[PDB]
JSON list of C-alpha atoms in Angstrom, two decimals:
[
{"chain": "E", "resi": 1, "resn": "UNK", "atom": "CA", "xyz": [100.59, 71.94, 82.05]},
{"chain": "E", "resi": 2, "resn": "UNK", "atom": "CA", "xyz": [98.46, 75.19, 83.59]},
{"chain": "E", "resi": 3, "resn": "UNK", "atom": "CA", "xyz": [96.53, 72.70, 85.49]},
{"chain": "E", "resi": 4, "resn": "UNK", "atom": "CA", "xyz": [98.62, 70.11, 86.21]},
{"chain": "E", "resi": 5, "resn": "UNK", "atom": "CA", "xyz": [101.16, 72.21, 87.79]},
{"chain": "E", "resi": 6, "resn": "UNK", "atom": "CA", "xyz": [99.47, 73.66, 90.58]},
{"chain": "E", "resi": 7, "resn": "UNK", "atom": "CA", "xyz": [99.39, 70.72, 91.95]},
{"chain": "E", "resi": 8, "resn": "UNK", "atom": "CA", "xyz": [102.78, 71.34, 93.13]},
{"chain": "E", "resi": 9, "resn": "UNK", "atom": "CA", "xyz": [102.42, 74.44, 94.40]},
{"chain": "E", "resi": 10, "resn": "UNK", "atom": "CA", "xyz": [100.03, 72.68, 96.77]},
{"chain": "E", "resi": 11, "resn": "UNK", "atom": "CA", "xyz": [103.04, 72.20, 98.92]},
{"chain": "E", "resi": 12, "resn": "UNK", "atom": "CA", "xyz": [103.82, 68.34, 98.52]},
{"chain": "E", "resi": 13, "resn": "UNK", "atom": "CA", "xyz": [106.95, 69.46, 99.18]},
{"chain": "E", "resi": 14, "resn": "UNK", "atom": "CA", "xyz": [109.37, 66.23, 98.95]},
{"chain": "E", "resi": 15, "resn": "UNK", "atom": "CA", "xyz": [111.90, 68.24, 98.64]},
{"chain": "E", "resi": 16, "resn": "UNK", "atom": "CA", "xyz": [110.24, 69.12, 95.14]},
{"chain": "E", "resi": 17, "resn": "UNK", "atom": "CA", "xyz": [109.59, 72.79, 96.12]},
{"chain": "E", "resi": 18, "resn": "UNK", "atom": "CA", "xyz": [113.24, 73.48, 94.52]},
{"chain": "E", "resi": 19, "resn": "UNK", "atom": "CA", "xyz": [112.21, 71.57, 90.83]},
{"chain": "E", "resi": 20, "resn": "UNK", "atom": "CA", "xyz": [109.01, 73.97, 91.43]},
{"chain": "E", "resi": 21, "resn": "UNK", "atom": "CA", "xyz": [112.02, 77.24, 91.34]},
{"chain": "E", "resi": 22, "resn": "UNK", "atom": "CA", "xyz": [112.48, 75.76, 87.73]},
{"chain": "E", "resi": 23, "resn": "UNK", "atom": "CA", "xyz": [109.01, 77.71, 87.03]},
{"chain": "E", "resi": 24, "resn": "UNK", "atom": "CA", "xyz": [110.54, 80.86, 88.09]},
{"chain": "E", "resi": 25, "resn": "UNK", "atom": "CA", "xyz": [112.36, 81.17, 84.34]},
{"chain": "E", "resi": 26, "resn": "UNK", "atom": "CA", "xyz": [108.91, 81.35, 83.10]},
{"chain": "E", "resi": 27, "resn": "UNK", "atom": "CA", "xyz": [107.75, 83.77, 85.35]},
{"chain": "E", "resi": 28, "resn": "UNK", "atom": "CA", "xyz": [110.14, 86.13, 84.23]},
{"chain": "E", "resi": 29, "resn": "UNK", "atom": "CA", "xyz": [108.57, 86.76, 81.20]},
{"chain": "E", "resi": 30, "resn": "UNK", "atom": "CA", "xyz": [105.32, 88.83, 82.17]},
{"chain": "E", "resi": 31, "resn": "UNK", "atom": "CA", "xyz": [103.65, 87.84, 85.41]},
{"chain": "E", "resi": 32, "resn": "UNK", "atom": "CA", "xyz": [101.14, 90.46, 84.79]},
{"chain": "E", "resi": 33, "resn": "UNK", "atom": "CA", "xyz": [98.83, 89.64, 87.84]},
{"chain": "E", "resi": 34, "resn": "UNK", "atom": "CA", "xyz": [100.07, 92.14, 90.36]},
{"chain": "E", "resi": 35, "resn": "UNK", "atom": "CA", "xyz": [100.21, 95.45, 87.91]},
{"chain": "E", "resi": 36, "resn": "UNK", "atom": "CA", "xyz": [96.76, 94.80, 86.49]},
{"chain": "E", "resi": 37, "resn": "UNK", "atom": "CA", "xyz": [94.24, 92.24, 87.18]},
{"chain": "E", "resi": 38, "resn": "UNK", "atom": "CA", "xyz": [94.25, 88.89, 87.39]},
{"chain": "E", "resi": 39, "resn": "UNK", "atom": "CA", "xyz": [92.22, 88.56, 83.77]},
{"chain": "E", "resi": 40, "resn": "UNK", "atom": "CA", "xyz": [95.10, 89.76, 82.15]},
{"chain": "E", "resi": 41, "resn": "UNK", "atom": "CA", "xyz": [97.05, 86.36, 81.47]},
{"chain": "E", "resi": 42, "resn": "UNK", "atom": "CA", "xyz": [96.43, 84.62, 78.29]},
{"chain": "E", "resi": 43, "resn": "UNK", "atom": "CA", "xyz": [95.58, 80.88, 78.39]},
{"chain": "E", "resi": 44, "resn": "UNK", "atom": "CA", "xyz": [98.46, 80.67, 81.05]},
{"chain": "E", "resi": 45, "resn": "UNK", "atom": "CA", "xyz": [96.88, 81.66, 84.30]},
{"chain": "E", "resi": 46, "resn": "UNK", "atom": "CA", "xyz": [94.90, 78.21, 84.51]},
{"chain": "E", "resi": 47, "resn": "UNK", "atom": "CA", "xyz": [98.74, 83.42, 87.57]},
{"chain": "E", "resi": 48, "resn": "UNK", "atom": "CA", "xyz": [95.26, 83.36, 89.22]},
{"chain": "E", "resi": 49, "resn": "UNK", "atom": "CA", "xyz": [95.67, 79.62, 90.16]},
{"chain": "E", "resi": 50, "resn": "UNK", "atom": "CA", "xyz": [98.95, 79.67, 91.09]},
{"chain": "E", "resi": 51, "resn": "UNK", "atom": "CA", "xyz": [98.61, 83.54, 93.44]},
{"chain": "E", "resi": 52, "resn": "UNK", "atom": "CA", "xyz": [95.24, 81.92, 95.00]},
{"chain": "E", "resi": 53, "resn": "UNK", "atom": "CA", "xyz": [97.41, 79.40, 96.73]},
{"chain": "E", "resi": 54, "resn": "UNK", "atom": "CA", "xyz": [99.94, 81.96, 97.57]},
{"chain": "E", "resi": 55, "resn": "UNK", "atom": "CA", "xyz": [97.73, 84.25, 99.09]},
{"chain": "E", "resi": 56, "resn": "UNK", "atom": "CA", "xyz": [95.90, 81.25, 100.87]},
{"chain": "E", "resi": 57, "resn": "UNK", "atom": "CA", "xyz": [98.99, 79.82, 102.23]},
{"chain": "E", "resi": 58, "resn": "UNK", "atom": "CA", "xyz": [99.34, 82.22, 105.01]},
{"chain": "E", "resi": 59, "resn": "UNK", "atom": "CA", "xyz": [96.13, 80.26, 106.86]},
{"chain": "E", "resi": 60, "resn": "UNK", "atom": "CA", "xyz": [98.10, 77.77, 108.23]},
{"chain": "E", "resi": 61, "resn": "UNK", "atom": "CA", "xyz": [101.03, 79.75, 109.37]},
{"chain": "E", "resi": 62, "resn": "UNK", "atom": "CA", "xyz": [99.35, 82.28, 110.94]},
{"chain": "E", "resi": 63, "resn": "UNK", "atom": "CA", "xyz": [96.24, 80.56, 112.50]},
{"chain": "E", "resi": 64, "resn": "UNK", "atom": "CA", "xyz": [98.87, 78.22, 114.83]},
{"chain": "E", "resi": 65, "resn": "UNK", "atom": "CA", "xyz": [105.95, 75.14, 110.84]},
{"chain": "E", "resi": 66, "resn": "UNK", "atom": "CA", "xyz": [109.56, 74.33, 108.66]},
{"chain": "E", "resi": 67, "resn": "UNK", "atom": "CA", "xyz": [107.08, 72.81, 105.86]},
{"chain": "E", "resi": 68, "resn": "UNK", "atom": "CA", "xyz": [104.83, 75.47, 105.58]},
{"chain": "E", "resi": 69, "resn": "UNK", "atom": "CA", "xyz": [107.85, 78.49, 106.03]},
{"chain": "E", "resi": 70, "resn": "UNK", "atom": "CA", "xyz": [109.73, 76.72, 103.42]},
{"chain": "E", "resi": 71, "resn": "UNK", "atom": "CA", "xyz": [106.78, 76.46, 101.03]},
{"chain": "E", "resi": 72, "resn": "UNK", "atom": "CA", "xyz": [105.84, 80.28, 101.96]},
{"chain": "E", "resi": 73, "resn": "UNK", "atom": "CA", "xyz": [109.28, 80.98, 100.95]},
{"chain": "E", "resi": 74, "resn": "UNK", "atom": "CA", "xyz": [109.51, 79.38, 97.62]},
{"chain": "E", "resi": 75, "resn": "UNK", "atom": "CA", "xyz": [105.84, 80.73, 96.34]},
{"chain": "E", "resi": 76, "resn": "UNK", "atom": "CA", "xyz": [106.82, 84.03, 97.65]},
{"chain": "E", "resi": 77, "resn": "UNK", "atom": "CA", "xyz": [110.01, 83.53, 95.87]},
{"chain": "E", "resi": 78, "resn": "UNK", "atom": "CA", "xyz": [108.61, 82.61, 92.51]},
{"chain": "E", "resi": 79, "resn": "UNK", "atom": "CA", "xyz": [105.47, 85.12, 92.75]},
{"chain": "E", "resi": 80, "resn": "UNK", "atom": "CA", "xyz": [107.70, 87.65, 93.21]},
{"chain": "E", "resi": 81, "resn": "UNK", "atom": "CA", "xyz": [110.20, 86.80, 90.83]},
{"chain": "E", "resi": 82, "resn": "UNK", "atom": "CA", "xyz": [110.07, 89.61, 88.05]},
{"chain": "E", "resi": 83, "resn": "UNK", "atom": "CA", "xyz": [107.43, 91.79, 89.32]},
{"chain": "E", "resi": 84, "resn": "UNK", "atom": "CA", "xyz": [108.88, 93.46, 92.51]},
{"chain": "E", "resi": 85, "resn": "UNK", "atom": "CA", "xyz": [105.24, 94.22, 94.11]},
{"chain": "E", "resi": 86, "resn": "UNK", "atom": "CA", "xyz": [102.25, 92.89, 95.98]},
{"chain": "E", "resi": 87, "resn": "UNK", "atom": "CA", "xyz": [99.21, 93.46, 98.06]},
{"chain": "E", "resi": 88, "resn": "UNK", "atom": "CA", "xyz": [99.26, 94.71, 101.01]},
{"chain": "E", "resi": 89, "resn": "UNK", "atom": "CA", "xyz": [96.47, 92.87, 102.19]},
{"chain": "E", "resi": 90, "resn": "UNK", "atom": "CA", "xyz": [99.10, 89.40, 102.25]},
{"chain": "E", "resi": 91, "resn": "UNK", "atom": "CA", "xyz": [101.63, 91.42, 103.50]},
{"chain": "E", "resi": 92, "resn": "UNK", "atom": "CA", "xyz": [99.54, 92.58, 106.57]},
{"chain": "E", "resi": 93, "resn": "UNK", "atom": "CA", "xyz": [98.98, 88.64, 107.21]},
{"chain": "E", "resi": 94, "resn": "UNK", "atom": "CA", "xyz": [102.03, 87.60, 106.86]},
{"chain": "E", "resi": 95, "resn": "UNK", "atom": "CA", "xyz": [104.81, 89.71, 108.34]},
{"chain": "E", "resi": 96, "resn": "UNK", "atom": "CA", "xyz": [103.23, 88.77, 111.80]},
{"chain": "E", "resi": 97, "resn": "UNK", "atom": "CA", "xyz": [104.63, 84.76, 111.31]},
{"chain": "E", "resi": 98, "resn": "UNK", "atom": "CA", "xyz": [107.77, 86.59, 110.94]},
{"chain": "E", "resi": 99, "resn": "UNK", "atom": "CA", "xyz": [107.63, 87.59, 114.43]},
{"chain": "E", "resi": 100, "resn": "UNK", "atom": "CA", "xyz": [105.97, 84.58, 115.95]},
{"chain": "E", "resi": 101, "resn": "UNK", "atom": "CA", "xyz": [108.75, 82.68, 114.71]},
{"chain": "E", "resi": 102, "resn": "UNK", "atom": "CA", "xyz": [111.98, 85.39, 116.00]},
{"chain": "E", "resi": 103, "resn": "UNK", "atom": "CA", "xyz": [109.93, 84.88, 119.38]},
{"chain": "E", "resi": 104, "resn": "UNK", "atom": "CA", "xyz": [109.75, 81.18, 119.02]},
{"chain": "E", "resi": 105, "resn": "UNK", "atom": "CA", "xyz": [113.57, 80.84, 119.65]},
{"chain": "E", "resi": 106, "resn": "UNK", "atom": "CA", "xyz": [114.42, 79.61, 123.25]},
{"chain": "E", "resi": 107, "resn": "UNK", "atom": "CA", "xyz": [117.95, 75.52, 111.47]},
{"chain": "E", "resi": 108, "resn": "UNK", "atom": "CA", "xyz": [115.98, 76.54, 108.72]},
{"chain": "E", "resi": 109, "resn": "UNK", "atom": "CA", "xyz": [114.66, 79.47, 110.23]},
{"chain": "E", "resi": 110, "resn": "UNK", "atom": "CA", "xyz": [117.29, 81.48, 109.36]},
{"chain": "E", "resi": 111, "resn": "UNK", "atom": "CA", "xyz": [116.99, 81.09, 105.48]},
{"chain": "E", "resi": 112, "resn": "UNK", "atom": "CA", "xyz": [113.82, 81.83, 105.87]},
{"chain": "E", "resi": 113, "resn": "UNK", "atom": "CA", "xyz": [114.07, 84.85, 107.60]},
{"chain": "E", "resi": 114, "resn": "UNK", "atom": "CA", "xyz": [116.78, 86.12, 105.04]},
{"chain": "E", "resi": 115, "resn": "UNK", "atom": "CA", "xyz": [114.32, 84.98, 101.73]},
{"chain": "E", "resi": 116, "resn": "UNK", "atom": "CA", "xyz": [111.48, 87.00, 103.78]},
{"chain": "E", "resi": 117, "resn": "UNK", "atom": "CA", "xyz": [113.83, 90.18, 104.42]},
{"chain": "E", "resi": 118, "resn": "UNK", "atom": "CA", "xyz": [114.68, 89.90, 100.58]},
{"chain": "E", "resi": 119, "resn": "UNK", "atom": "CA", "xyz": [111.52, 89.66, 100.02]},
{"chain": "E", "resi": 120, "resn": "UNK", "atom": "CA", "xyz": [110.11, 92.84, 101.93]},
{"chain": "E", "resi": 121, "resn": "UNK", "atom": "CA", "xyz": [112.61, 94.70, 102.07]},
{"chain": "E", "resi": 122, "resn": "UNK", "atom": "CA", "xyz": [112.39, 95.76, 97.97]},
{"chain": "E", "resi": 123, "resn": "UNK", "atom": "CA", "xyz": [108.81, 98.24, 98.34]},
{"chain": "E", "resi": 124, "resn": "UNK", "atom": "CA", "xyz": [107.70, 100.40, 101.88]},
{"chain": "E", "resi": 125, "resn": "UNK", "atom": "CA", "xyz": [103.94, 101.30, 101.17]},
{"chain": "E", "resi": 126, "resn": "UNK", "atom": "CA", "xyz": [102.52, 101.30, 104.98]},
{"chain": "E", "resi": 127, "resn": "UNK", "atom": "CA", "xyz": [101.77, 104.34, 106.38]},
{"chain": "E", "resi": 128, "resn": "UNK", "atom": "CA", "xyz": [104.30, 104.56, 108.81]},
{"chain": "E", "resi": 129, "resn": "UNK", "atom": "CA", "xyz": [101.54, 102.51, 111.07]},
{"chain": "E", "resi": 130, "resn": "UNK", "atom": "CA", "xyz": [102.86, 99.22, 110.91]},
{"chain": "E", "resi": 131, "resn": "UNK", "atom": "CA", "xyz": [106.27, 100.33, 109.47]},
{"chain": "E", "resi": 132, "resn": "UNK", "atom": "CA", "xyz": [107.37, 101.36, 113.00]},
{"chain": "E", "resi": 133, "resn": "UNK", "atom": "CA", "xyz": [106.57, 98.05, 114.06]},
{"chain": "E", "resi": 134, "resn": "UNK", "atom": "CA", "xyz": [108.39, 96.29, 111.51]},
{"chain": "E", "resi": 135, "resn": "UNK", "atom": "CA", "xyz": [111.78, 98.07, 112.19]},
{"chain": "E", "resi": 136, "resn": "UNK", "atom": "CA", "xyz": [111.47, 97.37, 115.98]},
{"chain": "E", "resi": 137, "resn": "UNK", "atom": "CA", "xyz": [111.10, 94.39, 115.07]},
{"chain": "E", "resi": 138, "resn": "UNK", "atom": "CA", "xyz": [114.09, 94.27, 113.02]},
{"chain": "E", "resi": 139, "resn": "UNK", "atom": "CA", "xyz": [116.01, 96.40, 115.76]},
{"chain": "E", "resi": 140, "resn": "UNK", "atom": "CA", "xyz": [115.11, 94.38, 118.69]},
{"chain": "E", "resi": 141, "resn": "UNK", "atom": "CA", "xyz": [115.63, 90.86, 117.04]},
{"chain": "E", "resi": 142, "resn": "UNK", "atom": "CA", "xyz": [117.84, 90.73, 113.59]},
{"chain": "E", "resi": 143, "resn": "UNK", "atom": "CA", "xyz": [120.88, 93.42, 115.41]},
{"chain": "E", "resi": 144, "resn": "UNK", "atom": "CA", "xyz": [119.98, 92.46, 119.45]},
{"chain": "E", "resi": 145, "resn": "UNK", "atom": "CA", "xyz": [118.71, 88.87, 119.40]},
{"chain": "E", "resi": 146, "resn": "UNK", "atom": "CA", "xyz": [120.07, 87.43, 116.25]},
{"chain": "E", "resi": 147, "resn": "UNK", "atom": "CA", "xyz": [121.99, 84.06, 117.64]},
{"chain": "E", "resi": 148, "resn": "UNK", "atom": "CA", "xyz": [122.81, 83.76, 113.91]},
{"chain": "E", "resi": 149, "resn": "UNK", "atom": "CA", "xyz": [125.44, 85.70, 112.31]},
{"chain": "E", "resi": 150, "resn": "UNK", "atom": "CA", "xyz": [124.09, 85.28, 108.57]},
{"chain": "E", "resi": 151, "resn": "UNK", "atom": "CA", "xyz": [121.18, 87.06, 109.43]},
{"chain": "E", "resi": 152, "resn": "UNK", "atom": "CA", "xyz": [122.45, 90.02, 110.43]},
{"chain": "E", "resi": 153, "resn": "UNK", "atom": "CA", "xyz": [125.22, 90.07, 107.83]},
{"chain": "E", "resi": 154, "resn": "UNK", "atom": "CA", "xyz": [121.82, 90.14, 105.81]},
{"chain": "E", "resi": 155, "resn": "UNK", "atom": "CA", "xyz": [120.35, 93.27, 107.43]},
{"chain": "E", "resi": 156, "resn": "UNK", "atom": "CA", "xyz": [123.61, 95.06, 107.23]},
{"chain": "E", "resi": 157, "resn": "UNK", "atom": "CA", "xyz": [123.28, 94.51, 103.31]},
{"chain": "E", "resi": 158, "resn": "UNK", "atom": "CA", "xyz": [119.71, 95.73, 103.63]},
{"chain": "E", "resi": 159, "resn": "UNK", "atom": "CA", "xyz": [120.32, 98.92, 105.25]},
{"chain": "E", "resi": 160, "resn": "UNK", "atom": "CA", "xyz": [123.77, 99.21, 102.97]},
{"chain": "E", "resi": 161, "resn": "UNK", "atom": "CA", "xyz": [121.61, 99.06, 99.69]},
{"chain": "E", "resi": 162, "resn": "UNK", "atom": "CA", "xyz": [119.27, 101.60, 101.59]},
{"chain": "E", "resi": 163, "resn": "UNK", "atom": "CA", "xyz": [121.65, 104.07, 102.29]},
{"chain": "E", "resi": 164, "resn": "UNK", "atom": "CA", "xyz": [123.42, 103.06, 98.94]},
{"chain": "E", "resi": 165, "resn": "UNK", "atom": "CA", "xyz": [120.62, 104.44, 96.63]},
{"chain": "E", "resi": 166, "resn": "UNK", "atom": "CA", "xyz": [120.35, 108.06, 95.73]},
{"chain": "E", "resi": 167, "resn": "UNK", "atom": "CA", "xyz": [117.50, 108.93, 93.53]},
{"chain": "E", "resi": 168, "resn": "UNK", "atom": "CA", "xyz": [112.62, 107.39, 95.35]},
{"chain": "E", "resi": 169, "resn": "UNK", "atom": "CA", "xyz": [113.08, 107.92, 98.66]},
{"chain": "E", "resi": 170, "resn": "UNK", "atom": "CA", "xyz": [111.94, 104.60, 99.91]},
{"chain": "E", "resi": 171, "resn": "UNK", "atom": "CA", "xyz": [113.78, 105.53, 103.19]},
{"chain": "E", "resi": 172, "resn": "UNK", "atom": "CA", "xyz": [113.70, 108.17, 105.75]},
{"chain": "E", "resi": 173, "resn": "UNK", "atom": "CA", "xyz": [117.04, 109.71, 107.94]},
{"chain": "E", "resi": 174, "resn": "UNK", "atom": "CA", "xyz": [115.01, 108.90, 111.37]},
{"chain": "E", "resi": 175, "resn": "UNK", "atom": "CA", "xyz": [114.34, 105.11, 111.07]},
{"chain": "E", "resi": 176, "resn": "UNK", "atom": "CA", "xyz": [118.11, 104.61, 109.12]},
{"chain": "E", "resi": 177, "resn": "UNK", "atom": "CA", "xyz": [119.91, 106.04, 112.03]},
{"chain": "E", "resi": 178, "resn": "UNK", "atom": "CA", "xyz": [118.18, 104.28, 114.85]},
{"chain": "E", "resi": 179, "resn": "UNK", "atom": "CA", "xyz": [119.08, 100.99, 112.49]},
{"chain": "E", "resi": 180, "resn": "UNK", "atom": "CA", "xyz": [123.11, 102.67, 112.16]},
{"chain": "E", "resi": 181, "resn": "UNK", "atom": "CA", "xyz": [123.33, 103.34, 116.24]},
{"chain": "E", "resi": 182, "resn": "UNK", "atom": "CA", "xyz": [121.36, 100.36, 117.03]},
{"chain": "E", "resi": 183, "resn": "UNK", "atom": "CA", "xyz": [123.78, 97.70, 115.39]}
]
C-alpha cells in the first residue's frame, strides 16, 4: 500500500485529499523523517516518497491556485502531523505564496491561511532575517487588511498561546507588543 498510496498524494484531488487525512492516524505513530534521516523508516517509507512530493509541491505555487493551496495544505497537514518540525529550506519557499496570495485580494483562501498559520506558527528558527518580514506581514495583512473575521480571530489565538506559555522562549517582548498595539 507504500506504493500505491502516493499516488494520492499526487494531488488528484476529487475532493479525495480529505480520505488522504485518514493517513494522518498512521502518521502519528513515528514519522521519523524530519528528526533523523530519511533512511530511518522501515519497509514503510516506499516517508521519503510521500515528503518528496511535499517538498516538490511548492513548484507550482510559487513559480506562477485553490487546487494546489488546498493540496499544500493537506500534505503539510499530514507531514506535520506528530512531528512538530521541518526544514527550513521548504519553509523559505513557501511562506512567500502566503503573501502572493494576501496581495492577490482585490473563499478558500481563508482556511488556508489559518491551516498555514497553524502550521508555522508552532517552531521560530530564522534568524530574525526573514522573521521580521513574516510579522509585517502578519501586522500589515491578518490585523489591517484581513476582510475576514476568522482569520484574525485566528491570530489573536496565536499571539494568546504566545503570550500564554511560560517556560523556551520562542517569543520576544519587541515583536509581541507591536502585534498587542497593532490589533
Amino acid at each position: 500500500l507504500q506504493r500505491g498510496i502516493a499516488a494520492c498524494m499526487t494531488c488528484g484531488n476529487t475532493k479525495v485529499l480529505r480520505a488522504v487525512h485518514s493517513l494522518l492516524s498512521r502518521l502519528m505513530s513515528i514519522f521519523p523523517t524530519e528528526p533523523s534521516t530519511s533512511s530511518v523508516a522501515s519497509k514503510y517509507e516506499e516517508e521519503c516518497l510521500y515528503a518528496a512530493v511535499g517538498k516538490v509541491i511548492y513548484e507550482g505555487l510559487t513559480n506562477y491556485n485553490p487546487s494546489q493551496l488546498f493540496g499544500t495544505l493537506m500534505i503539510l497537514k499530514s507531514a506535520c502531523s506528530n512531528n512538530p518540525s521541518y526544514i527550513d529550506r521548504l519553509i523559505s519557499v513557501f511562506m512567500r505564496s502566503l503573501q502572493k496570495m494576501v496581495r492577490e485580494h482585490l473563499g478558500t483562501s481563508e482556511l488556508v491561511m489559518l491551516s498555514l498559520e497553524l502550521v508555522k506558527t508552532r517552531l521560530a528558527v530564522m534568524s530574525m532575517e526573514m522573521r521580521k518580514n513574516f510579522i509585517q506581514a502578519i501586522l500589515t495583512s491578518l490585523i489591517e487588511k484581513s476582510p475576514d473575521a476568522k482569520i484574525l480571530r485566528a491570530v489573536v489565538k496565536i499571539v494568546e498561546e504566545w503570550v500564554k506559555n511560560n517556560s523556551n522562549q520562542t517569543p520576544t517582548l519587541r515583536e509581541k507588543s507591536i502585534l498587542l498595539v497593532k490589533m
